[PDB]
Amino acid sequence: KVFGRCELAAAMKRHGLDNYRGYSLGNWVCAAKFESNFNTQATNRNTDGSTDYGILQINSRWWCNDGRTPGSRNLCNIPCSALLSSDITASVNCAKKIVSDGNGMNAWVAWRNRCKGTDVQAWIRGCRL
Ligand SMILES: [Cl-]
Ligand SMILES: [Cl-]
């Protein structure tokens, strides 16, 4: 599913991401834009052989199981395919675990490089929330 900008903001808000671990909703929408272009079915292979899955490009080395990432963990206790669903519940729950891990949203390199420090509120501007 390809979400609309404000549609995703609304779904993220309902799932409790607005200001989760102090990160305003615009941060989450900004991260999703550059990780996946709001596409739940986005997948991308990493150099180390792991894969990134879903609207927030959650990785199979630590967070989900895809059956093909050696020596990896599955700390969100989910098949990585659940992160591709039109229902973003799995992605949000797992993202909550990731952002609680110590380095906050710096876990998302694209958030650090493209969202952090910018006017992320622009991403939810005009949205009925
Ligand atoms: Cl957009
Ligand atoms: Cl914001």
Ligand SMILES: [Cl-]
């Ligand atoms: Cl694996």
Ligand SMILES: [Cl-]
């Ligand atoms: Cl599994």
Ligand SMILES: [Cl-]
């Ligand atoms: Cl949803």
Ligand SMILES: [Cl-]
């Ligand atoms: Cl980047």
Ligand code: NA
């Ligand atoms: Na894994």
